[PDB]
C-alpha cells in the first residue's frame, strides 16, 4: 500500500526495487516537477547558486535537476543500493551515507539552503526500540538548524497520511527554533496535493 | 485540370445518370435516394445570376443557408455565400471541389484561445 509500511529505508529500498524504481518515467516526471517547484519555492538570489543540503535525494533526480541549471549540491542518503544506482547515473554532486536523525555532521553557518525530497514523513514511526521518534526528530531539526546559515531557506516535500503526524513534525520544528510555516500544493485536490515545510532562521 | 482521369470539358457533357462512379460513396447514395427541389431552385438562382452577368469578370454572389448540398461538376464559375450561424461567408467555386460539400467552407465555431506563490515569512 505505502512504502512506509514495508519496513526500514535501509532494507526496503534494496537492489531490485531501486532497479525497478529508476525505470519509471512517471517517477521521473513527478520528481522533476517537484524539484522545479522546490527550487522555485526558496527565494534564493538569481544568477548565484546556493549551497544546498540535498537530503532524501536517493537516485539524485532532484540532484540531476539541480546540476542541470548549474547549481551545486551534496547528497545525504541512508540506502547504499540506490546510492550506487545514483553513482551509475554519472551524477555530478557528492553523496553521503548515514542516518539524518543522528545529526548532520557539518560545520555551522555552511548551507545556504536545504532541499528535502520525501524524507521527513519517513521518520515519524520507529522501527527499532532504541530509536525514539520524538528524540530523533528533535535531534535532526536541531542539527539542521545548527548547520544552516542564519537566514537560509529550507524546503521539505512531504505527503502526510493524517493530521497528527503533521502536528508532531510542526511541534518539533517550532520547538527546534525554526521560523516559517506550511505551503500546500492544491489542498482541495487529491492527485496534485503536495505538502511543503518551509523554514528559515529568523 | 482533371478529376478521376476526366477533364472538365467532358465532365460538363457527362450527364446525371452516370455520375455514380466518379463520386465517393456518400454523395452516390445521396443522389440515389432522390434529390430534392429546394437545391434545384438554388441551382436556378445560381444560373439566373450566371446569365446576365457580363462574361469578362466574376458574376454576382448567390447566398443561402444550404450547407449540405452536393457540388456538381458544372458549378465552376459561381460565388456561394453560405451561412455559418451569424454571417455569409462568400467563396469562389474552384474546379477542385467537385467531391466536397458546402459545410467545410463555412466553419460554425471560432478557434479557441486559452505567477506562483513565494512565501516571505
Amino acid at each position: 500500500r505505502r512504502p512506509e509500511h514495508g519496513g526500514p529505508p535501509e532494507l526496503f529500498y534494496d537492489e531490485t526495487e531501486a532497479r525497478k524504481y529508476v525505470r519509471n518515467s512517471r517517477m521521473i516526471d513527478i520528481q522533476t516537477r517537484m524539484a522545479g517547484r522546490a527550487l522555485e519555492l526558496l527565494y534564493l538570489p538569481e544568477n548565484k547558486p546556493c549551497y544546498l543540503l540535498d537530503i532524501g535525494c536517493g537516485t539524485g533526480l532532484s540532484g540531476s535537476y539541480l546540476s542541470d541549471e548549474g547549481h551545486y549540491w551534496v547528497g545525504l542518503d541512508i540506502s547504499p543500493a540506490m546510492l550506487d544506482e545514483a553513482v551509475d547515473r554519472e551524477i555530478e554532486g557528492d553523496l553521503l551515507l548515514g542516518d539524518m536523525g543522528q545529526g548532520i555532521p557539518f560545520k555551522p553557518g555552511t548551507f545556504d539552503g536545504c532541499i528535502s525530497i520525501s524524507a521527513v514523513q519517513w521518520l515519524c514511526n520507529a522501527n527499532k526500540k532504541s530509536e525514539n521518534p520524538a528524540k530523533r526528530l528533535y535531534c535532526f531539526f536541531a542539527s539542521l538548524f545548527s548547520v544552516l546559515v542564519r537566514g537560509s531557506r529550507a524546503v521539505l516535500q512531504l505527503y502526510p497520511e493524517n493530521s497528527e503526524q503533521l502536528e508532531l513534525i510542526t511541534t518539533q520544528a517550532t520547538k527546534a527554533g525554526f521560523s516559517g510555516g506550511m505551503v500546500v500544493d492544491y489542498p482541495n485536490s487529491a492527485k496534485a496535493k503536495k505538502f511543503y515545510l518551509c523554514l528559515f532562521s529568523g | 485540370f482533371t478529376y478521376r482521369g476526366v477533364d472538365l470539358d467532358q465532365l460538363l457533357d457527362m450527364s446525371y445518370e452516370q455520375l455514380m462512379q466518379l463520386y465517393s460513396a456518400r454523395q452516390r447514395r445521396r443522389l440515389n435516394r432522390g434529390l430534392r427541389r429546394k437545391q434545384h431552385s438554388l441551382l436556378k438562382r445560381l444560373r439566373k445570376a450566371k446569365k446576365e452577368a457580363p462574361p469578362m469578370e466574376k458574376p454576382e454572389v448567390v447566398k443561402t443557408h444550404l450547407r449540405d448540398m452536393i457540388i456538381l461538376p458544372e458549378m465552376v464559375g459561381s460565388m456561394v455565400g453560405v451561412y455559418n450561424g451569424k454571417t455569409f461567408n462568400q467563396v469562389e467555386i474552384k474546379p477542385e471541389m467537385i467531391g466536397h460539400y458546402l459545410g467545410e467552407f463555412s466553419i460554425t465555431y471560432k478557434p479557441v484561445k486559452h505567477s506562483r506563490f513565494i512565501p516571505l515569512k
Binding site: 525554526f178 521560523s179 506550511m182 500544493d185 485536490s189 | -
Partner: peptide, 29 residues
Amino acid sequence: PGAEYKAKKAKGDVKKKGRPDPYAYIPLN
C-alpha cells in the same frame, strides 16, 4: 484553508486570475 480557491459547484481547485495559482498558507507558532 484555501476556502477562496474551493469551487462552489464542484469538488476540486479552481483557478483565479487576479491572484496566483491556488494554494493555502498557514503560519507556525
